[PDB]
Design an enzyme around this catalytic site. Structure first.
Site, PDB file in Angstrom:
ATOM      1  N   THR A 178      -2.856   0.794  -4.427  1.00 40.36           N
ATOM      2  CA  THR A 178      -3.493   1.928  -3.696  1.00 40.36           C
ATOM      3  C   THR A 178      -4.890   2.257  -4.135  1.00 40.36           C
ATOM      4  O   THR A 178      -5.000   2.455  -5.321  1.00 40.36           O
ATOM      5  CB  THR A 178      -2.200   3.037  -3.458  1.00 40.36           C
ATOM      6  OG1 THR A 178      -2.848   4.114  -2.696  1.00 40.36           O
ATOM      7  CG2 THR A 178      -2.059   3.547  -4.967  1.00 40.36           C
ATOM      8  N   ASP A 224       0.865  -1.201  -0.188  1.00 41.94           N
ATOM      9  CA  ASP A 224      -0.029   0.107  -0.050  1.00 41.94           C
ATOM     10  C   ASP A 224       0.871   1.286   0.028  1.00 41.94           C
ATOM     11  O   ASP A 224       2.052   0.972   0.197  1.00 41.94           O
ATOM     12  CB  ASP A 224      -0.910  -0.043   1.101  1.00 41.94           C
ATOM     13  CG  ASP A 224      -1.960   1.060   1.426  1.00 41.94           C
ATOM     14  OD1 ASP A 224      -2.830   1.356   0.448  1.00 41.94           O
ATOM     15  OD2 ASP A 224      -1.631   1.981   2.135  1.00 41.94           O
ATOM     16  N   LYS A 225       0.381   2.208  -0.546  1.00 44.96           N
ATOM     17  CA  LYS A 225       0.983   3.705  -0.508  1.00 44.96           C
ATOM     18  C   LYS A 225       0.906   4.687   0.757  1.00 44.96           C
ATOM     19  O   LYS A 225       1.750   4.789   1.367  1.00 44.96           O
ATOM     20  CB  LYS A 225       0.808   4.318  -1.937  1.00 44.96           C
ATOM     21  CG  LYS A 225       1.471   5.575  -1.901  1.00 44.96           C
ATOM     22  CD  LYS A 225       1.082   6.394  -3.055  1.00 44.96           C
ATOM     23  CE  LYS A 225      -0.709   7.169  -2.976  1.00 44.96           C
ATOM     24  NZ  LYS A 225      -0.476   7.897  -1.754  1.00 44.96           N
ATOM     25  N   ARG A 266      -6.463   3.638  -7.360  1.00 49.62           N
ATOM     26  CA  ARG A 266      -7.695   3.532  -7.277  1.00 49.62           C
ATOM     27  C   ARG A 266      -8.378   2.166  -7.377  1.00 49.62           C
ATOM     28  O   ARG A 266      -9.170   1.739  -7.992  1.00 49.62           O
ATOM     29  CB  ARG A 266      -8.437   4.499  -8.261  1.00 49.62           C
ATOM     30  CG  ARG A 266      -8.043   5.901  -7.926  1.00 49.62           C
ATOM     31  CD  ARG A 266      -9.232   7.071  -8.345  1.00 49.62           C
ATOM     32  NE  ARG A 266     -10.339   7.008  -7.649  1.00 49.62           N
ATOM     33  CZ  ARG A 266     -10.218   7.551  -6.681  1.00 49.62           C
ATOM     34  NH1 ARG A 266      -9.390   8.274  -6.172  1.00 49.62           N
ATOM     35  NH2 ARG A 266     -11.677   7.413  -5.850  1.00 49.62           N
ATOM     36  N   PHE A 299     -10.572  21.306  -8.793  1.00 53.64           N
ATOM     37  CA  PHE A 299      -9.483  20.525  -9.416  1.00 53.64           C
ATOM     38  C   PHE A 299     -10.426  19.350 -10.268  1.00 53.64           C
ATOM     39  O   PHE A 299     -10.123  17.969 -10.306  1.00 53.64           O
ATOM     40  CB  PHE A 299      -8.577  19.481  -8.435  1.00 53.64           C
ATOM     41  CG  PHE A 299      -7.565  18.747  -9.083  1.00 53.64           C
ATOM     42  CD1 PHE A 299      -6.624  19.539  -9.772  1.00 53.64           C
ATOM     43  CD2 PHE A 299      -7.449  17.496  -9.232  1.00 53.64           C
ATOM     44  CE1 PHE A 299      -5.548  18.748 -10.333  1.00 53.64           C
ATOM     45  CE2 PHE A 299      -6.063  16.786  -9.541  1.00 53.64           C
ATOM     46  CZ  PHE A 299      -5.248  17.460 -10.242  1.00 53.64           C
ATOM     47  N   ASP A 337      -5.940  -3.180   3.063  1.00 54.91           N
ATOM     48  CA  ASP A 337      -4.698  -3.793   3.185  1.00 54.91           C
ATOM     49  C   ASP A 337      -4.875  -5.218   4.168  1.00 54.91           C
ATOM     50  O   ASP A 337      -4.232  -6.250   3.907  1.00 54.91           O
ATOM     51  CB  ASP A 337      -3.791  -3.041   3.980  1.00 54.91           C
ATOM     52  CG  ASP A 337      -3.477  -1.700   3.364  1.00 54.91           C
ATOM     53  OD1 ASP A 337      -3.518  -1.885   1.964  1.00 54.91           O
ATOM     54  OD2 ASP A 337      -3.143  -0.758   3.956  1.00 54.91           O
TER      55      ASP A 337
END
Ligand SMILES: *[C@@H]1O[C@H](CO)[C@@H](O[C@@H]2O[C@H](CO)[C@@H](O[C@@H]3O[C@H](CO[C@H]4O[C@H](CO)[C@@H](O[C@H]5O[C@H](CO)[C@@H](O)[C@H](O)[C@@H]5O)[C@H](O)[C@@H]4O)[C@@H](O)[C@H](O[C@H]4O[C@H](CO)[C@@H](O)[C@H](O)[C@@H]4O)[C@@H]3O)[C@H](O)[C@H]2NC(C)=O)[C@H](O)[C@H]1NC(C)=O
Ligand SMILES: C[C@H](C/C=C/C=C/CC/C=C/C=C\CCC(C)(C)C)[C@@H](O)[C@H](O)[C@H](O)[C@@H](O)[C@@H](O)[C@@H]1OC(=O)[C@H](O)[C@H]1O
Ligand SMILES: *[C@@H]1O[C@H](CO)[C@@H](O[C@@H]2O[C@H](CO)[C@@H](O)[C@H](O)[C@H]2NC(C)=O)[C@H](O)[C@H]1NC(C)=O
Ligand SMILES: *[C@@H]1O[C@H](CO)[C@@H](O[C@@H]2O[C@H](CO)[C@@H](O)[C@H](O)[C@H]2NC(C)=O)[C@H](O)[C@H]1NC(C)=O
Ligand SMILES: *[C@@H]1O[C@H](CO)[C@@H](O)[C@H](O)[C@H]1NC(C)=O
Ligand code: BEF
Ligand SMILES: [Mg+2]
Lengths: 1088, 349
Positions: A635, A380-381, A737, A494, A767
């Site tokens: 992630t 995982d990030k 994603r 954004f 996770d």
């Protein structure tokens, strides 16, 4: 559906066993080892009076001990799991009972009313009812993918009207229309309806419930005031638990490889039994036709031949039962438990920050040797490779870099004016609320880490943001307390490819200048300027500066400026008001309005924010890649953040070409096929799998794939095969994603199609599923609910701890376990082989050559300590070399320590050595007396000589099979034979009155015989000579990297591993986070 | 590492060679005479004359220091006499006349060798009751359920001693060995083999002189002891402690071909001459293709005549010397540097 009125019980229930049902499932998982079934069969056979040797109780005792020890191990593991789960299901949640009483997370059914306050997790899924800030809006945190603070708007009409507890009690607004519990984290539906509410048609209005209203379990860490809600989808129907899975019963690869070896040994034993039965039956028929003295009275139903052939079959299975020893599994379990303890007690993988110490805990006491065979790591990030801390590092103001501002600010220099404008844009173009709880601190509660860091930096290095106590903003420049009017917001959030954010403002002074402050990406802002010549020069200088910023690795935002004339300001305000209510294509209308207002901007500079990784992550990843382990990232965050982190973690080097696969235009399978054809076409092996843009510089390929593309890949099989081929042919794969189930699917894809060992590391529920789906799961303790820690096999606090864990502990554990199992098989084969070679000379009657005491204590006393020492203390190479040279991990990773070939070598070595022992001592004792006293040679003299020789040979073989040496090794290797010698000396003097003992007088028949004293040493030397020569010639002719490095360290300690020409000298952008609509949209309505 | 391996091989060889030579020398200092009298029932004359035994019925194993050859010794002769007027156990007598080529020093032992006799069979090896033999109180159920199967009891009277080992006691005796041409006068001289001491002094304690819990009339003799005890134990229990042939027999032999001690002499010399030995043939072994022999042997520091261990040591020494020479040649041809770094995986093309 539910239709609750004011379902799934409660509790996470991560415990594998239950008090009611623990013995049955534990016994089943223990009897999944085949050898346990064989032991049970042997014990049941020995229960019969005919085959009894000692007693039924003592025969069943070893199996009961094995079962009890494994059961106690599993029970301790599950008690730790129960404690971890109870730390979760006994937290504090306030539930209505006319007051809010404390609960325990368990007395919370669907319905109820929960007040969750601030900065604490959720008991279950709730539907927003009221909040203390405005419009009943609330905020959420990570641990459910993403890395920014989200927003939840309201319930609509049910919002408000419930500020106090009395309104919650007096109102029975329920009969929600909740849909079925789904694993997807983007869909919820319902309707409050309310018991007392009527429209113009006397009907109860429908109040839709969506994801913007609900807030899931285990992930809130609320960053606003108190929130009240209605518990729905409670229990195991929550999103988090459903995305998780049941706790598996993982087993090491060494055990799965041991099963075929046990089967081979059982087949050998069956063949021995069949041969013994056939030959014994033929011999007994012949010896009954002609009445031999050993076959007299063979006419009963249990002593005649045929029945005697079956009895010989059974007695052969009993006599050679040590070909699959029962002490092997007890020793293996104890050694693995002590290896887990070593992992726990290692001080180099122990973390101590802010006064709390977090040791590395082995949740699964097996799987220690599994750490030494890792080929793929899925990481995982957020929270694993990152610390979740954004720190401002460098700022560029026009042309000059910074890393002096007070000296620069001369109030007359144009650079000073540009700095003033830059900091004003940084501190005013923000959707951040400032709290005045403590004067001077000016707490900034921002919805994004980037905005919080930027505002804090602006305050610390000059312009301080006062707050938004009213509709007019205020600023604190270090000259006085200034203030400026706040006009209509123009935030692009954004979203809709608008990589920008602008805030129209006004000045409270008599000047009344309308100025637009805009921030955004590099390309958008740069193309969105008015460049005649001077802005062109400024743009090229800022582009060079931003290239410098990205080279070091930073997240950059480009600020802008504009002065709006009142006429155009009023005209665009009218246009914006008209486009506010446009019904169809409202997003298109606001995009056109944004393009209209953004027609020309003057550049001010750029920023550079660093997403701080955990210490040692790039070095750890470099070492892992040197070791040959392919590291992937799975992630739930967006593609830009993932690729930026991959660049900063050295996962994606500057010499890699990115293959970005995402849903859109061309199909996902077509994209993968085109990528394969255009980037790996010159591959001979690609055509075997073929039977059915963007980059930096050639030299390598990396794959970046989104969640939707992965879903389309996993839906079918051809696309899955293409994805597997591309991912295996690439350096690293970044998956962005992805849902928890998609992480599990990636892990299963690799583990099933390639068959390689996999490791998963992370710190969340996603996770959790990924960890359960992998061979070894590692959790990171970060005060994030501890769910990944609870569902993992190992709990670390840092990535570098994983690096050391693998490189030293996994390699050592794999080496020790392989050597221990092989030596156990070897010594048991030695004993069984001596018995068998005697069975050649006895008529194949399955008779013990040894006195039964010498075979009963073969594993208890004679040969236990060398095996334990090999399994616990044996080191092939020191840990400094393994940490310094990760390339030594190849032997452990490629599985060159355990396999069928090594097993066969050890078995055949045992067979040869047993043959040497028995045959040489037999032909030695083929004589009249063997001493000068004239006494005859009976069976037990030769038997005891052979037993002592076999014990010596086995112990010295185990000693030769140890790379390290100290006093303890000598102690074990000569403690076995010392025990057998003392036992032979004392047991042979026990008078027959005290105990029959069978071997009375062997201290006279052996210790005074030349045959004994010249046979046991000769047997030992001849048995061990081939092993000694093979080991020497293998180490001096066909040497491994580990053996060569051991020699180098022993003879050349002065060589520096890290910097040596042949050892160490060879060594062998833009980012922004936003909520993407919601409260910012609701901010427009409030300020409209 | 081979620098510490080649000297090990040299030391092993240089130590093994003297030990093997010493073992061979000790074995060669022993003399063994074997006489196979199994076929004396039918192949030997019954008229009192003596006929030369077949070449396969005897085997001389002379000492290395002997000045005579195996073929030089005169062939032994045997005669047979089966008379029913003699007492039980001596009706059939086989008298074998054999020549001792040279004086055999003190320490002469007499053995009987049985071939194709599987004492190591699982049924036979454990067919005895140590508790009953030692004299402890054993009931009928206990002896029936013990290891003494299949010879446990009959008609409620237990067998003492029970089991297959006791039932198959070797009842062939060699009462006399007499020199026929004594140099010191007289017509003949009897070589005094003593049946005492043929078993170690501790084997007695495994057995009891008498049983204090069952009357002798309530115990059945073993089925094959019927000809020795016709009416049963009418003169008290057999003294299993004071007889050593039973104790020697009860010790299970390792191999089907085994030798068990029967009489010994420790202070006399068998002078050169012709000796006549009488064997009372009572134990048939021909039924199961077995043979019974008479073995007369001396003893050295290693025991009997078996130079196998010495030759194994010599062969091991020769092999070790050959291996050490080959290793030295290989090391001199291509000496390799210990702890190099050019053969690592990364430091190669
Ligand atoms: C020196 O030692 C040797 C051996 O150690 C002695 O030789 C043995 O002497 C025994 C006593 O005379 C013999 O036993 C007798 O045998 C006769 C006839 O033999 C056959 O009898 C049966 C057929 O008719 C049958 O007997 C059983 O044999 C086996 C067990 O013995 C069983 O497996 C089998 O199924 C039979 O059930 C066999 O076919 C025999 O071949 C028997 O009639 C005798 O029985 C009498 O005595 C017993 C005593 O317990 C009693 O129960 C009976 O009811 C009956 O009264 C007896 O068993 C033995 O055969 C013989 N062995 C050899 C190889 O020769 C030798 O005598 C001894 N000499 C001296 C001087 O000491
Ligand atoms: C008490 C002992 C065994 C003890 C078990 C208890 C163990 C406690 C923890 C396990 C220890 C063992 C080895 C590890 C040593 C360390 C703990 C690592 C220091 C015996 O009681 C045991 O039962 C014997 O090992 C044999 O009885 C049996 O194993 C025999 O093996 C065979 O081949 C036979 O079929 C069986 O009869
Ligand atoms: C010595 O002679 C007796 C009888 O003269 C032999 O005993 C007989 O042996 C035969 C074997 O075929 C049996 O059938 C008889 O039942 C036995 N008894 C009698 C009274 O005849 C004895 O075997 C001879 N000893 C030998 C050959 O060593
Ligand atoms: C075996 O013992 C007998 C009796 O003790 C010995 O016979 C005696 O031998 C001496 C020596 O010539 C004679 O003087 C006696 O007269 C003999 N006694 C009898 C009763 O014959 C015989 O010598 C001993 N055998 C050996 C080899 O020493
Ligand atoms: C030994 O000699 C005596 C007397 O000369 C004689 O009675 C006896 O039978 C002889 N023993 C033999 C020849 O075995
Ligand atoms: F950072 Be992971 F997607 F939880
Ligand atoms: Mg995470």
């Amino acid at each position: 559906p539910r239709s609750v009125f004011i379902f799934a019980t409660n509790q996470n229930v991560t415990s594998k066993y239950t008090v009611i049902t623990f013995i049955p499932k534990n016994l089943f998982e223990q009897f999944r080892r085949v050898a346990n079934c064989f032991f049970l069969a042997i014990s049941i056979l020995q229960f019969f009076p005919k085959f009894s040797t000692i007693s039924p109780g003592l025969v069943i005792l070893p199996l009961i001990i094995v079962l009890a020890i494994t059961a106690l191990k599993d029970g301790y593991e599950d008690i730790k799991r129960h404690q971890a789960d109870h730390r979760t299901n006994h937290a504090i949640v306030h539930v209505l009972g006319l007051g809010w009483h404390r609960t325990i997370w368990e007395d919370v059914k669907v319905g109820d009313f929960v007040k969750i306050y601030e900065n604490e997790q959720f008991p279950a899924d709730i539907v927003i009812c009221a909040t203390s800030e405005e419009e009943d809006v609330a905020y959420i945190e990570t641990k459910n993918l993403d890395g920014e603070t989200n927003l939840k708007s309201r319930n609509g009409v049910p919002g408000l009207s419930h500020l106090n507890t009395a309104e919650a009690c007096a109102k029975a607004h329920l009969c929600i229309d909740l849909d079925a519990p789904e694993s997807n984290m983007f869909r919820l539906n319902g309707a409050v309806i309310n018991l007392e509410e009527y429209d113009e048609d006397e009907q109860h209005p429908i109040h839709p419930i969506t994801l913007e209203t609900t807030m899931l379990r285990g992930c809130v860490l609320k960053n606003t005031a108190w929130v009240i809600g209605i518990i729905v989808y409670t229990g195991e129907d929550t999103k988090i638990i459903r995305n998780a899975g049941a706790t598996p019963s993982k087993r090491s690869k060494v055990e799965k490889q041991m099963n075929p070896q046990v089967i081979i040994n059982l087949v050998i034993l069956a063949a021995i039994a069949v041969v013994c039965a056939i030959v014994d039956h033929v011999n007994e028929v012949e010896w009954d036709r002609q009445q031999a003295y050993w076959m007299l009275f063979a006419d009963t139903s249990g002593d005649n031949p045929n029945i005697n052939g079956l009895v010989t079959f059974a007695n052969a299975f009993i006599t050679f039962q040590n070909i699959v020893p029962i002490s092997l599994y007890i020793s293996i379990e104890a050694v693995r438990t002590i290896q887990a303890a070593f992992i726990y007690w290692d001080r180099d993988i122990k973390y101590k920050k802010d006064g709390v110490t977090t040791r590395t805990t082995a949740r699964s006491w097996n799987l220690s040797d599994d750490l030494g065979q890792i080929e793929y790591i899925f990481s995982d990030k957020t929270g694993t490779l990152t610390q979740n801390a954004m720190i401002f590092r460098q700022c560029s103001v026009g042309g000059k870099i910074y890393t002096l501002d007070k000296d620069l600010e001369a109030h007359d220099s144009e650079q000073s004016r540009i700095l003033h404008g830059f900091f004003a844009v940084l501190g005013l173009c923000h959707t951040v609320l400032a709290a005045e709880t403590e004067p001077g601190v000016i707490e900034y509660k921002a919805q994004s880490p980037d905005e919080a860091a930027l505002v804090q930096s602006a305050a610390d290095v000059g312009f301080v943001f006062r707050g938004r106590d009213h509709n007019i903003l205020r600023m604190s420049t270090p000259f006085s307390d200034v203030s400026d009017e706040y006009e209509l917001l123009h935030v692009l959030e954004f979203n809709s490819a608008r990589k920008r954010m602008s805030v129209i403002l006004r000045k409270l002074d008599e000047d009344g200048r309308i100025f637009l402050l805009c921030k955004g990406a590099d390309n958008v802002i740069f193309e969105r300027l008015t460049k005649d010549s001077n802005q062109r020069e400024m743009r090229e200088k800022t582009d060079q500066d931003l290239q410098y910023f990205a080279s070091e690795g930073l997240r950059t935002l480009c600020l802008a400026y504009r002065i709006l004339d009142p006429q155009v300001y009023e005209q665009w305000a009218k246009e914006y008001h008209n486009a506010t209510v446009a019904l169809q294509d409202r997003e298109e209308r606001i995009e056109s309005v944004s393009s209209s207002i953004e027609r020309d901007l003057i550049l001010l500079g750029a920023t550079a924010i660093e997403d701080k990784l955990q210490d040692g992550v790039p070095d750890t990843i470099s070492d892992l890649k040197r070791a040959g382990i392919k590291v992937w990232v799975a992630t739930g965050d967006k593609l830009e953040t993932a690729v930026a982190i991959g660049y900063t973690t050295n996962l994606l080097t500057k010499d890699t070409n990115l293959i970005v696969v995402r849903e859109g235009r061309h199909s996902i399978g077509d994209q993968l096929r085109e990528a394969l054809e255009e980037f790996f076409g010159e591959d001979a092996g690609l055509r075997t799998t073929l039977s059915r843009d963007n980059g930096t510089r050639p030299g390598g390929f990396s794959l970046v794939i989104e969640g939707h593309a992965l879903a389309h890949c996993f839906d079918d099989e051809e696309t899955e095969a293409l994805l597997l081929a591309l991912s295996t042919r690439c350096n690293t794969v970044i998956c962005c994603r992805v849902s928890p189930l998609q992480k599990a699917q990636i892990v299963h894809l690799i583990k099933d199609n390639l068959g390689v060992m996999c490791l998963a590391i992370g710190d969340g529920a996603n996770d959790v599923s990924m960890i359960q789906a992998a061979d070894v799961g590692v959790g990171i303790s970060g005060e994030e609910g501890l769910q990944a820690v609870n569902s993992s096999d190992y709990a670390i606090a840092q990535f570098r701890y994983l690096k050391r864990l693998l490189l030293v502990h996994g390699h050592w554990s794999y080496f020790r376990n392989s050597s221990m199992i092989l030596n156990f098989f070897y010594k048991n084969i030695i004993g069984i082989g001596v018995l068998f070679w005697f069975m050649i000379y006895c008529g194949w009657s399955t008779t013990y050559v040894f006195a039964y005491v010498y075979l009963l204590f073969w594993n208890v006393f004679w040969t236990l300590v060398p095996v334990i020492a090999i399994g616990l203390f044996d080191r092939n190479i020191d840990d400094e070399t393994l940490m310094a040279l990760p390339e030594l991990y190849r032997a452990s990773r490629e599985g060159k320590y355990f396999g069928l070939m090594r097993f066969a070598y050890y078995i055949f070595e045992g067979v040869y050595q047993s043959a040497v022992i028995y045959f040489f001592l037999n032909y030695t004792y083929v004589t009249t007396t063997a001493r000068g006293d004239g006494y005859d040679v009976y069976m037990y003299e030769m038997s005891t000589t052979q037993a002592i020789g076999a014990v010596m040979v086995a112990n010295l073989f185990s000693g030769l099979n140890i790379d390290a040496w100290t006093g303890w090794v000598w102690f074990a290797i000569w403690f076995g034979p010392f025990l057998i010698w003392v036992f032979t000396a004392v047991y042979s003097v026990i008078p027959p009155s005290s105990f029959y003992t069978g071997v009375y007088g062997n201290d006279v028949f052996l210790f005074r015989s030349a045959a004994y004293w010249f046979g046991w040493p000769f047997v030992t030397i001849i048995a061990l000579l081939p092993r000694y020569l093979i080991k020497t010639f293998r180490q001096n002719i066909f040497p491994n990297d580990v053996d060569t490095m051991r020699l180098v360290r022993k003879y050349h300690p002065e060589v520096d591993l890290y910097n040596h020409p042949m050892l160490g000298g060879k060594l062998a952008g833009f980012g922004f986070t936003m909520e993407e609509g919601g409260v910012a949209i609701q901010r427009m309505q409030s300020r409209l | 590492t081979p620098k510490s391996v080649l000297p090990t091989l040299l030391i092993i060889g240089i130590i093994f060679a003297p030990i093997g030579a010493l073992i061979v020398w000790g074995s060669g200092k022993v003399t063994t005479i074997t006489l196979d009298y199994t076929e004396c029932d039918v192949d030997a004359p019954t008229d009192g004359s003596y006929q030369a035994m077949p070449n396969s019925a005897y085997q001389y194993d002379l000492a290395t220091s002997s000045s005579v050859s195996e073929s030089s010794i005169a062939s032994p002769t045997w005669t047979f006499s089966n008379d029913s007027s003699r007492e039980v156990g001596e009706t059939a007598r086989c008298e074998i006349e054999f020549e001792v080529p040279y004086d055999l020093g003190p320490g002469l032992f007499l053995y009987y060798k049985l071939t194709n006799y599987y004492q190591n069979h699982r049924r036979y090896s454990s067919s005895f009751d140590a508790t009953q033999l030692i004299g402890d109180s054993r009931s009928l159920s206990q002896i029936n359920g013990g290891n003494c199967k299949p010879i446990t009891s009959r008609d409620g009277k237990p067998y003492y001693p029970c089991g297959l080992i006791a039932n198959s006691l070797f009842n062939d005796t060699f009462p006399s060995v007499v020199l026929l041409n004594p140099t010191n006068g007289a017509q003949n001289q009897t070589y005094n083999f003593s049946e005492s001491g043929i078993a170690w002094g501790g084997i007695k304690k495994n057995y009891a002189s008498t049983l204090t819990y069952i009357s002798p009339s309530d115990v059945l003799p073993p089925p094959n002891w019927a000809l020795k005890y016709p009416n049963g134990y009418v003169d008290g229990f057999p003294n299993l402690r004071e007889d050593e042939h039973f104790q020697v027999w009860m010790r299970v032999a390792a191999l089907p071909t085994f030798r068990k001690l029967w009489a010994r002499n420790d202070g006399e010399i068998m002078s050169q001459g012709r000796y006549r030995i009488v064997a009372n043939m009572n134990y048939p072994v021909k039924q199961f293709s077995g043979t019974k022999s008479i073995v007369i042997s001396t003893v050295s520091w290693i025991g009997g005549k078996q130079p196998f261990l010495g030759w194994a040591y010599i062969a091991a020494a020769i092999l070790c010397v050959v291996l050490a020479v080959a290793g030295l040649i290989r090391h001199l041809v291509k000496p390799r540097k210990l702890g190099d770094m050019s053969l690592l995986s990364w430091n190669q093309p």
